[PDB]
Amino acid sequence: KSPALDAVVIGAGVTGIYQAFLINQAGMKVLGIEAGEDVGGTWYWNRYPGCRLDTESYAYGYFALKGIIPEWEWSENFASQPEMLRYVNRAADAMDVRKHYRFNTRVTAARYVENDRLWEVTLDNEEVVTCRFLISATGPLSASPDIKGIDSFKGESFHSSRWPTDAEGAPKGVDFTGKRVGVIGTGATGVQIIPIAAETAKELYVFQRTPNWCTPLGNSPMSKEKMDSLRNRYPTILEYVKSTDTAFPYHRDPRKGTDVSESERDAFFEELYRQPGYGIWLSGFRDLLLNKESNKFLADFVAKKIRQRVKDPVVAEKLIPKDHPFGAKRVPMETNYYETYNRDNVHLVDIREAPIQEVTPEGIKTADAAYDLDVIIYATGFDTGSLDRIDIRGKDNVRLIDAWAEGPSTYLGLQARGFPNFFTLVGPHNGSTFCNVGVCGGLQAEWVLRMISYMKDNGFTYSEPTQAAENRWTEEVYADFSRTLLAEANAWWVKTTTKPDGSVVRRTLVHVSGGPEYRKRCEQVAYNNYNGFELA
Amino acid sequence: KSPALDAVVIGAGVTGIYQAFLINQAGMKVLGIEAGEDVGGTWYWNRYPGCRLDTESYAYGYFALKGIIPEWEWSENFASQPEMLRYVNRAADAMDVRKHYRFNTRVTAARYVENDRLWEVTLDNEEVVTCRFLISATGPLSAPDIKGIDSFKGESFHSSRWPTDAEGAPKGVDFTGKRVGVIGTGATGVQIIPIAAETAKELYVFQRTPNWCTPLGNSPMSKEKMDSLRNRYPTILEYVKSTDTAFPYHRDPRKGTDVSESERDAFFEELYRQPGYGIWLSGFRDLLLNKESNKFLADFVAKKIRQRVKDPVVAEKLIPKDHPFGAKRVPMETNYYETYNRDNVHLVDIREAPIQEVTPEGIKTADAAYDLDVIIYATGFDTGSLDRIDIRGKDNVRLIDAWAEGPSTYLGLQARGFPNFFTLVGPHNGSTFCNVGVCGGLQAEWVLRMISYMKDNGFTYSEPTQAAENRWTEEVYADFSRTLLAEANAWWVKTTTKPDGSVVRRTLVHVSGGPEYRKRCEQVAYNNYNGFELA
Numbered sequence A: 001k002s003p004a005l006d007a008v009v010i011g012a013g014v015t016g017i018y019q020a021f022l023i024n025q026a027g028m029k030v031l032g033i034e035a036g037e038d039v040g041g042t043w044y045w046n047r048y049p050g051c052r053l054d055t056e057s058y059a060y061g062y063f064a065l066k067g068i069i070p071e072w073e074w075s076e077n078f079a080s081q082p083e084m085l086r087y088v089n090r091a092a093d094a095m096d097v098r099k100h101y102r103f104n105t106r107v108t109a110a111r112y113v114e115n116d117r118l119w120e121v122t123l124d125n126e127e128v129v130t131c132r133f134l135i136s137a138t139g140p141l142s143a144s145p146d147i148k149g150i151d152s153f154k155g156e157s158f159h160s161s162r163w164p165t166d167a168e169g170a171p172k173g174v175d176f177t178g179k180r181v182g183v184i185g186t187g188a189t190g191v192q193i194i195p196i197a198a199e200t201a202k203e204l205y206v207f208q209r210t211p212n213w214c215t216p217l218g219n220s221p222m223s224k225e226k227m228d229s230l231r232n233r234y235p236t237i238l239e240y241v242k243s244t245d246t247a248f249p250y251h252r253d254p255r256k257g258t259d260v261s262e263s264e265r266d267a268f269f270e271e272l273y274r275q276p277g278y279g280i281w282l283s284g285f286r287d288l289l290l291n292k293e294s295n296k297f298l299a300d301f302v303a304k305k306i307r308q309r310v311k312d313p314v315v316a317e318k319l320i321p322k323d324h325p326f327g328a329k330r331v332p333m334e335t336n337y338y339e340t341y342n343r344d345n346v347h348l349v350d351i352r353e354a355p356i357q358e359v360t361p362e363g364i365k366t367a368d369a370a371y372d373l374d375v376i377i378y379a380t381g382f383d384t385g386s387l388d389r390i391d392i393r394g395k396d397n398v399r400l401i402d403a404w405a406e407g408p409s410t411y412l413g414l415q416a417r418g419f420p421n422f423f424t425l426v427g428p429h430n431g432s433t434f435c436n437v438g439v440c441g442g443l444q445a446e447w448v449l450r451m452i453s454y455m456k457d458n459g460f461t462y463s464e465p466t467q468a469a470e471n472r473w474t475e476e477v478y479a480d481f482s483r484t485l486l487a488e489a490n491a492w493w494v495k496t497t498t499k500p501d502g503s504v505v506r507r508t509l510v511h512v513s514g515g516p517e518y519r520k521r522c523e524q525v526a527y528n529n530y531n532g533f534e535l536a
Numbered sequence B: 001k002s003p004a005l006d007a008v009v010i011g012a013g014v015t016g017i018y019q020a021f022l023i024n025q026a027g028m029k030v031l032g033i034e035a036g037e038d039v040g041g042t043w044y045w046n047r048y049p050g051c052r053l054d055t056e057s058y059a060y061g062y063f064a065l066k067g068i069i070p071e072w073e074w075s076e077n078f079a080s081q082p083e084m085l086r087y088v089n090r091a092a093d094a095m096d097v098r099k100h101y102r103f104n105t106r107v108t109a110a111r112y113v114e115n116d117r118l119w120e121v122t123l124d125n126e127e128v129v130t131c132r133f134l135i136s137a138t139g140p141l142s143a144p145d146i147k148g149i150d151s152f153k154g155e156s157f158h159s160s161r162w163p164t165d166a167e168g169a170p171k172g173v174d175f176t177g178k179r180v181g182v183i184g185t186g187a188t189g190v191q192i193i194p195i196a197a198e199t200a201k202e203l204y205v206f207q208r209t210p211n212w213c214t215p216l217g218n219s220p221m222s223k224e225k226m227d228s229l230r231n232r233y234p235t236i237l238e239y240v241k242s243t244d245t246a247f248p249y250h251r252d253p254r255k256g257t258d259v260s261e262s263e264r265d266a267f268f269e270e271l272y273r274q275p276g277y278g279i280w281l282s283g284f285r286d287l288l289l290n291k292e293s294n295k296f297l298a299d300f301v302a303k304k305i306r307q308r309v310k311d312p313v314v315a316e317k318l319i320p321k322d323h324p325f326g327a328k329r330v331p332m333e334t335n336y337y338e339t340y341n342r343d344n345v346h347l348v349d350i351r352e353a354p355i356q357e358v359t360p361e362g363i364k365t366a367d368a369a370y371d372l373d374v375i376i377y378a379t380g381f382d383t384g385s386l387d388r389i390d391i392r393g394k395d396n397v398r399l400i401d402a403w404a405e406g407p408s409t410y411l412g413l414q415a416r417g418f419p420n421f422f423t424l425v426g427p428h429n430g431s432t433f434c435n436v437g438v439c440g441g442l443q444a445e446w447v448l449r450m451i452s453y454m455k456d457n458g459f460t461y462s463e464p465t466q467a468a469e470n471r472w473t474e475e476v477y478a479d480f481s482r483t484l485l486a487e488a489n490a491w492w493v494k495t496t497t498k499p500d501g502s503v504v505r506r507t508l509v510h511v512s513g514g515p516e517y518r519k520r521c522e523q524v525a526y527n528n529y530n531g532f533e534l535a
C-alpha cells in the first residue's frame, strides 16, 4: 500500500511549523499534528510569571532573519512569553501553515510497517493516518517533585509547567497580597518567578536544596533606532549566528584564562557581567569548560558578585554553588533575583540540611520547622523526553524507549537504526541543550527537507542508518562530551551499561558538539549520497 | 568633494563581475573597468589548446549554484576554456552587468585623496574617475628571459596570448610536418604537450625540473547526470561552502601513518583512478603536516608514473625529488605521461644543459642544437596583478613599498595605509588552494555587506588599525609555518632583516581553511567591524 502523506510532522512549536512549511513549499503532502489549540509550542504552553528568552530576541527570531517576517519589530531585547507567542502567530500567518495542521489532536502511537515502508500514526487512540516519513518536533524539553503529601495541601498550588490561565491567556492568581507563599525550586523558572512573587507576597519562603549559577539578563526595551539598525544588519547577523558554536550571538575568547593576569581577568569579567545576555558565559576564555582552573577564575568572580548583591553573608553563601563548575548547565539569567533576598519578607530555606519531610494541609514540613502557607509554587526544572509519551514501534515491534534505554543511539542525531523514515528534530541528543533553537532547529529542518527531496527525486522510499554509521556517530558524540567539564559535573547525563557479554557501553544524553562542525558533517554525508544511510 | 561613484571594481573576471553585480543590485553606483574587450578574465585571456578546469564544472559554477543562471548545462565534467567563456558570458548577460563596465580600459594608477576620503582612479594615464571605495579584482595570478627570442624565424606561440581565429578558438594547433619545441611543463605545458604531440612531426619538451601531476579523468556530462546535479544544487552549495577548499572534497579523518601499507596503497589506487582532485583533497588529514605521510603518497604517484612511462630513464626525469606532493596546486593532466612513449617525443633536461639562446633555426642548449619550426613558451606563474598599477595611499606611499616585506593586511582584504580599498581574491587571502568560483563569490558578498553597513551608518572611511593588521598577518604566517609548505616553497615566505637587526617573516600565501577564515570575518563584521577604524 502507498501512504496518504509524504510526511507527518508532530508539533506546532517553532521547529514543527517551519518543517511543515518547507515540506508543503517543496510541493509534498504534509500533515501537522498539534495537541494544543494553536501554534507556539514553548510559547503557547508556558505562561508562568517572568517567562522570557535567554537568547537576544533578534537572534532567536530566525523567521525574521530568513525574511519570512522581515518587518517584525521586537519590543524588548529578551522577549517575554506573550511577545514570543505573537511572534510565532505572525510567522504562522505568513507561512500560511495552520491549514496543514490538525490542532487539539494527540499522536498516541506510531507504527512502522515494513512491507509498505510507511508509518501508521494513531491520533487520540482511534484514527490512523499513514505517511512515508514521520518527523518529530515534539519539543527538546519535558516537565521535570519527590515529596510526600503534595496532594494534601489545602491552599493554592501552582506548577510552572502548567500555570493556570484566564480568558485572555494571561496567568491566573499572580497577585499574592496577604498570602504566605512557598517556592520549591531555584532553577531557571524559579529564578524568574521568585522576584515577581516577592513584589506582592505577604511572606515568601524559598525552598532550595542546591543553588544554580545565575547571571544578570540585563533586559531593556528595544528602541526604534536599534530595531531598524538590527534589521539593516540581518544578513551579517544571520551569517554570524550560523557560524558560532551555539548559534547565540557570541563566540569564545581565543586566549586561555592563564594567558592573562588576575588583574586583566577581573576587569574582563566585570565588563562581561555588566553586559546584557550570555557574554559572561559564551564570550569567556576558550578553556572555560575544558579546564578546572580556568573555570574557577570565573566561578569565583561570580561568587564575589553574589556576595556583593546579597546583604546577609550567611544567605549569600547559601546561594553560591560549591559543588559544580560555572556553565555546566544552561545558565539561568535573572532580573533582580539575588536582591530579592534583601527583602524583609523573603526567607531562604535550605532543604539540603533540613529536607522536606512532607507537604501537609497547612503548608510544608521540614525536619527543622513547619511553614504555614497559603500558596506553594512548584518552580520545577527540566530534563525523560517528549517522545516517551508516544508508543513508537519500529521494525520487529521494537519500542524506541527500549532502543534508547542505554542512551540515545542515532546517526547524525536524526535517525535511529530500527526506525526507518523517522526524523527526530531538536532534542538533547542532537544539541538543543546549549543551542539557540530558533536557529539550530531551523537549519536542521532545512537539512531534513533536502534529504526528503533527494529521496523523492531518486524514487527512494526507505532510509535507515547502518549499524556502523550509528555506532561510530554515537561513540564520537560521547567522546566530544567526555573531553569537557560537563561529564564529571553532570553524572546523570551519561548512561553506562555493562552488557551480558561484558562490554561497557557509554552514551551521552546530551550532544554538545559545535553546530557548524555538526552541520559540516551532515553536508559531507548528504553530498556523498547519504553515506551511512541505507537508501532503497 | 564627493566621489562620483560608490565604487570602482577593477577587472571583469568571475570575481569582478560578481562584485559589480552585487553592488549595483544593492542600489549603489558602481563602475567596472576591464583591460580586455569583454568579460571572462582567465577564461577570456587564456586561449591555448587544452586549457581546462581543475575543479568539477558544477562546483566551480557558483553562478549556476546561486540561481543566477540555474538552467546552465555543463557539457563535460571539467569544462574547456571555450565552454567556461560561454558560462561567464551567459552569467554576465543574466546579471546585465556589462552596461556598468568600461572595456578596453586599463587602470594605470589609483591615488587616495586624504582630504576627501575617495580614490582618484587614472585610466590609460588620461581620464580620472572618483569613487568612495576601490575594489581590486585584478586576478590571483599575474602574466621568459632567454637571449634571442625575437631572432627565431619559425612560429612562436606564447600560452598567455595564444592567437585566435574569428570564432575565437586557438589558431595554428595543427603541427603536421613541423618540429615543435615546448618550453615548460607547469599547468599550461602539461595541457598543451599531449595535444601538440597528436600532430607534431617531432616534439621536444624543454623541462628544468618536473612538477607532480595527476590524471584529471575528464569525460562528457550526460543529460541524466546534469539534471541530477541541478536537483541537488542546494546540497552541493552547502557542501562546497563547508569544505576547506570549496572543492567538493574533504580529507580522510585518519593520519597516513595510522593506516597499513596495503590499505594505503589500495586507498591511493582507487583515488588515483577517480576523476578530479580526490587523490589530493580526499587524502589523509596529515598529507601537508607530516613528511612520512606525504612521502607515502609521493612514492605512490611515482610508482604510477613509472607504470605509465615505458622508458625508466625518461620516467625518472618526470618524477620530482625536490618537493613533497601537493605543496603547489597540482596540475591535472589528460594522457600527459603517455606522450613520452611516442617515438617522436623527446624530453630535454635543461637543468642538465640550460638553454643558451633561441636562434633563427631553433634552440641552443649548453649541450646541443635543436632545429625547430615552432616554439611554444608554456609559461608559469611567479609578483602580483596589482604591481602593474601605481597605487598610492596616505602620505603618497606606494602599495609596492607597503608590501615590500610581504603582504600585510587585515582579514586579507584591506591594508593599513590604504583606506577604502579592498583586495579581492589573491594569494594573500586564500586563492592558491581554493575553488575560486566559490571562495571569490563568498568574499564579494562579505565586502558588499561591509559597504552596505557603511552606507547605512553614513561612514565614508575604513582602515585597519596597526594592531589588527599585525595580529592578523602574524597569525597567517603562524598557521602557514606549521605545514610542509614552509619548507617545500621557501619562496612563499619573505624573510626581511630590518635596519635595527630584527627579523620579519611574512607568508605570500594564506592557507587557512575557507570556513574558518569566513567565521573570523563574520566575528569582525558582527562586532561593528572591530579592527577597522570607521568614520
Ligand SMILES: Cc1cc2nc3c(=O)[nH]c(=O)nc-3n(C[C@H](O)[C@H](O)[C@H](O)COP(=O)(O)OP(=O)(O)OC[C@H]3O[C@@H](n4cnc5c(N)ncnc54)[C@H](O)[C@@H]3O)c2cc1C
Pocket: A010, A011, A012, A013, A014, A015, A016, A033, A034, A035, A036, A040, A041, A042, A043, A046, A051, A052, A053, A054, A055, A060, A105, A106, A107, A108, A137, A138, A139, A140, A141, A386, A389, A390, A426, A435, A436, A437, A438, A441
Ligand atoms: C521557559 C522556556 C524558555 C526558553 N528559552 C529559550 C531561549 O531563550 N533560547 C532558546 O534557544 N531556547 C529556549 N527554550 C527552549 C525551547 O524548547 C526552544 O526554544 C523552542 O521553543 C522549541 O521549539 P520546538 O518546536 O522544537 O518544540 P516545542 O516548542 O516544545 O513544541 C513542541 C510541540 O509538540 C507538541 N506535541 C508534543 N507531543 C505531541 C504529541 N504526542 N501529539 C501532538 N502534539 C505533540 C506540543 O504540544 C508542543 O506544542 C526555552 C524553553 C522554555 C521551556
Ligand SMILES: Cc1cc2nc3c(=O)[nH]c(=O)nc-3n(C[C@H](O)[C@H](O)[C@H](O)COP(=O)(O)OP(=O)(O)OC[C@H]3O[C@@H](n4cnc5c(N)ncnc54)[C@H](O)[C@@H]3O)c2cc1C
Pocket: B010, B011, B012, B013, B014, B015, B016, B017, B033, B034, B035, B036, B040, B041, B042, B043, B044, B046, B051, B052, B053, B054, B055, B060, B105, B106, B107, B108, B137, B138, B139, B140, B141, B385, B388, B389, B424, B425, B434, B435, B436, B437, B440
Ligand atoms: C589556466 C587556468 C586554469 C584555472 N583553473 C581553475 C580551476 O579549475 N578552479 C579554480 O578555482 N581556479 C582556477 N584558476 C584560477 C583562476 O584565476 C580563477 O579561477 C578565476 O578565474 C580568477 O577570477 P578573477 O575574477 O579573480 O581574476 P581574473 O579571471 O584573472 O580576471 C582579472 C581581470 O582583471 C583585469 N585587470 C587586471 N589588471 C587590470 C588593470 N590594471 N586595469 C583594468 N583591468 C585589469 C584583467 O584583464 C582580468 O580580466 C585557473 C587559472 C588559470 C590561469
